[PDB]
């Protein structure tokens, strides 16, 4: 369960955002990608897999997964194959005028989302490190 | 200290790679960026800052840090401003033929680097930051 991520897509301004949610914690990684293709999805996954110990990704199983490229990255990386899209969009719309480019607003929104403290509440960022640390030791 | 990262640049095939190293662990985040500019550097930092609890980034203080945009992102994110290229390049050259694009090889190399094991860098950074949370 600390290894399980959910990958979805979401759309704003005519652009594609991939959102990876670490299910146990609610931590997110998200980025604008230029197109919802196997190759860009596989790149985004390979990046995620290098940064966190990703055991299983649950995806929407759509078009960008029926090909070779995501499967190749997942095999290589040893990965087995929302309210969150809505929340992220909400945060993006609060910071959107601060940045010219959507991608910057996305990463501000990821920062906000992951560091927000919902109380001695923990943020998503603290939750994910604590869940994985606990799993390691 | 758990919040301290070092940001360097490295070059391969005419492309720019930014490498952020979490100094206490050796964990890296690296990406190819289109150009060594303030804007692309500030984007890379803003991304890093949303994923890890980055308190200080040590950079090389060069041209992409003299303008506005890195400082605006570090201000926003609350980051203070102030071996590894070689190892990553080594890994990159071992996987390079597996990928058409340099960026893919870079992320394979980051994956190798961070997961290679008796802890890996990826385990070290989470254990260091989890220990910090209290």
């Amino acid at each position: 369960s600390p290894g399980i991520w959910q990958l979805d897509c979401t759309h704003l301004e005519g652009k594609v955002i991939l959102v990876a949610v670490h299910v146990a914690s609610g931590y997110i990684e998200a980025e604008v990608i230029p197109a919802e293709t196997g190759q860009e999805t596989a790149y985004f996954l390979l990046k995620l897999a290098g940064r966190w110990p990703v055991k299983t990704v649950h995806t929407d199983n759509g078009s960008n997964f029926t090909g070779a490229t995501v499967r190749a990255a997942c095999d290589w990386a040893g990965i087995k194959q929302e309210s969150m899209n809505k929340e992220l969009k909400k945060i993006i719309g609060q910071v959107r005028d601060q940045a010219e480019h959507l991608k910057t607003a996305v990463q501000m929104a990821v920062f906000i989302h992951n560091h927000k403290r919902k109380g001695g509440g923990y943020s998503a960022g603290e939750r994910i490190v604590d869940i994985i640390a606990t799993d390691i030791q | 200290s758990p919040g301290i990262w070092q940001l360097d640049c490295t070059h391969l095939e005419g492309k720019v790679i930014l490498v952020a190293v979490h100094v206490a662990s050796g964990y890296i985040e690296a990406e190819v960026i289109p150009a060594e500019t303030g804007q692309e550097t500030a984007y890379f930092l803003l991304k890093l800052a949303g994923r890890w609890p980055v308190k200080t980034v040590h950079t090389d203080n060069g041209s992409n840090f003299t303008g506005a945009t890195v400082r605006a992102a570090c201000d926003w994110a609350g980051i203070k401003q102030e071996s590894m290229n070689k190892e990553l390049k080594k890994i990159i050259g071992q996987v390079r033929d597996q990928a058409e694009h340099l960026k893919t090889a870079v992320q394979m190399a980051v994956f190798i680097h961070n997961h290679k094991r008796g802890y890996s860098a990826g385990e070290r950074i989470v254990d260091i930051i989890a220990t910090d949370i209290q």
């Binding site: 190759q39 490229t69 290589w76 | 990928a99 058409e100 394979m108």
Partner: peptide, 6 residues
């Protein structure tokens, strides 16, 4: 024929 392409 590569991981990301062909």
């Amino acid at each position: 024929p590569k991981l990301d392409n062909x």
